[PDB]
Amino acid sequence: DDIDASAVMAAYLAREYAEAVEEQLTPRERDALEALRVSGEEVRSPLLQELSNAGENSHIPAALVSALLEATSPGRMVTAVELCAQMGRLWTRGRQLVDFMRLVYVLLDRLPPTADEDLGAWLQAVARVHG
């Protein structure tokens, strides 16, 4: 039938932007991205089944990201990142698109000033362990 124009555009912009950011990442930042990748996988299943432990839009996940970043830790910040990613997985259409932008805003806006240095040493330490 017809297409969901907004979903086609979002898919295009998201990928073009992902490629852009990845391109501009410094080498030390690209090693961390990989470390963030693996560390996000280990928290995925415990996170999902804890979400399934209760419950079963943006308000609840945003409230969780906020609770995880309340002065926090690398492990909590990474758990918040994966929460956003998992909500992005099921927020792929229409008004759900908005809920994802608002959620990611809570994450980045509430990061502590220490995140640059703390996650730099943490994500790097994880990379050495998983090597």
Partner: peptide
């Protein structure tokens, strides 16, 4: 309810506190 979100947040924090030490260990 909102208190259910309070409980769930603490559970994700425990997961977070565990992930912090687990990934630098072994």
């Amino acid at each position: 309810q909102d208190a259910s979100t309070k409980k769930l947040s603490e559970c994700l924090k425990r997961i977070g506190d565990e992930l912090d030490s687990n990934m630098e260990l072994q």
